[PDB]
Write a protein that binds this DNA or RNA. Structure first.
Lengths: 237, 56, 247
RNA sequence: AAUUAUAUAACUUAUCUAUUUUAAGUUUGAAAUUUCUAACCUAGACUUACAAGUCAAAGUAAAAUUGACCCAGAUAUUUUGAGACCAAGUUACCCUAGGGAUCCUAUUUAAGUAUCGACAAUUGGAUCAGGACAUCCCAAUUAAUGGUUCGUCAACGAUUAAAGUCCUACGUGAUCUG
């Protein structure tokens, strides 16, 4: 294992992964987890550095978590710099930081955690339409990567406004919250607008989604409710 | 508590006398057939395992 | 810190609030986070005590967003135990009614949130993982943002309430990925009684046989991708609400 | 509180009444309870509420991750079982026992022992940081050397060589009173 994190290159990598602004400046972020790293490789994400433990590297399981990065034995200090979190994972990868439609649009910068959770639900839901703001916010951070958990693995303002012009209604959802399959989120056009993780979604968020022309499906757990909706969304299709 | 290696079983006389005694055997081995002293007949006779009492 | 130094029950409430095991022992389900506290709060729970940092509980800033949860001092170590988020609002742990059941152990958030999902839809009784499984525990309920006993969604069900959930004459369906169609089931068409088995435990064969008494058909959600199955508890939540609407 | 509360009282069912086709439940509470095959035998010993179970000279006899008893089982008398029960307040209605009033400081050391005296050993801020090593940054298996920003039990944004994990009555500036 490589335990030397004091190198200038290691310090730059540590700064980018540890700090989101450094990640945006350096364009590099870290994904923690062998499953998450493997999903990144399938998605085509190009990893810059692969963090493998002294035992994980020998087992080659961390090597499979390269996510297109070069896999080399790494100790805690080296792994910590590669990983965006303080605690480095055994397998981690340092990578870059209509009619009856299912569309979710988020303008401006979005919380990296929210993006990962939303993307993970989207993979289960299988929505054919996705909307987002520019790439300013980095969703490759270890916290964001943890939110995706491999399930997650640039629409900008102009295209994002196009989704808003479309006549779609965002199905409401709440911890307490009509039925999930009784809402035409997939059966009818949907423009998912709810309180993001960066701002927080209260019971008003469910009402706000209802105000978008949708009905109820009180803050619901982002992972649990989104996963439940994704299963209902698949049934809707 | 979670660990479990041996088990306690009833060894019953094959002579029909009804005399039984308890013995410990490994869970992963076959049922025991043992020659043991049976007081009713006052001589050693074959004993065959019938039922498991508990996990040791 | 204990809610009241002399009051042992107050200390237990505070400890249970910020403690998955202690909450299960004390039958308390905490909703970590002020917004999640409101989640359990708006789901029909009036948390007697809320796990929050001693100083934070005194300030009661998350209590403002609890919207029912009663801010209570919580030890830092206890807060970590209940971590799934600071404001853990500890709370006590029909025909065509929404019915979710996260049978067996599963993701703490999935079980709690799935059970609560039925409550808002009009669930007469929503269910979660059994008392043995950690679903109503402070941390377990914390991720779900729901209370077991107080909210219709129950996790510290115990033996008595456990038959109660099944005992209703609502056709039941186990929903993981391919348990007819999630919303087009006999159970979904009839009163909702969805009971998804644990993700790592599955559905018991006896439970499948018991489904005959209910008359429901296990939930099968078509999946375009090759994923083996979706969140079991999450599937139950969708089936739970879906059944009520169809019924 | 914890557990209840066939004192009574009610309702329900009986009961008992009309027609005609008190008891048992439950609830109030008079209250109550508790707390805050791997032997047998036999000196001398172990373990133990009791009991059983152990070690062991001699003797005799076969051979060469629980642990007993009680207590419940099974069957026909043979076998099989793993000294505040649990449990909050309040008392100036009380009782008894008493205790009061009626950056220093104390040692040790002594760089600079008349008089002194470092280093040591025994609300937010501003200013300045000290310390732990389980090493983030800086540095050569070794090392705590100095540092580790500003904001919005988790998380995010922007910088920084880095924003380790933390401790030091907001770490640390000299209201006023009880």
């Amino acid at each position: 294992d490589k335990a030397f994190p004091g190198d200038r290159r290691l310090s730059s990598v540590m700064t980018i992964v540890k700090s989101r602004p450094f990640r945006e400046k350096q364009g590099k972020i870290l994904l923690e987890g062998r499953r998450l790293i493997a999903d990144a490789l399938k998605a085509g994400a190009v990893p810059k550095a692969f963090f493998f433990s002294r035992l994980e590297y020998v087992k080659e399981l961390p090597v499979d978590k390269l996510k297109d990065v070069s896999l080399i034995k790494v100790k805690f200090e080296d792994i910590k710099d590669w990983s965006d979190l303080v605690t480095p994972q055994g397998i981690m990868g340092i990578f870059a930081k209509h009619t009856l439609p299912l569309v979710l649009i988020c303008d401006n910068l979005r919380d990296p955690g929210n993006l990962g959770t939303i993307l993970r639900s989207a993979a289960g839901a299988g929505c054919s339409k996705v909307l987002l703001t520019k790439g300013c916010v980095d969703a490759w951070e270890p916290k964001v990567l943890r939110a995706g958990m491999g399930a997650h693995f640039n629409v900008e303002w102009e295209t994002v406004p196009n989704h808003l012009p479309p006549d779609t209604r965002v199905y409401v959802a709440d911890n307490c919250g009509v039925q999930s399959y009784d809402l035409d989120w997939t059966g009818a056009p949907a423009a998912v607008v709810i309180g993001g993780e960066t701002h927080g979604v209260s019971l008003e968020s469910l009402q706000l989604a209802e105000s978008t022309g949708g009905k109820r499906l009180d803050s619901l757990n982002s992972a649990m409710a989104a996963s439940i909706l994704l299963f209902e969304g698949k049934r809707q299709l | 508590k979670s660990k479990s290696k041996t088990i306690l079983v009833k060894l019953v006389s094959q002579a029909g006398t009804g005399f039984s005694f308890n013995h410990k055997r490994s869970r992963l081995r076959e049922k025991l057939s043992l020659l043991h002293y049976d007081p009713i007949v006052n001589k050693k006779v074959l004993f065959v395992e019938q039922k498991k009492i508990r996990s040791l």
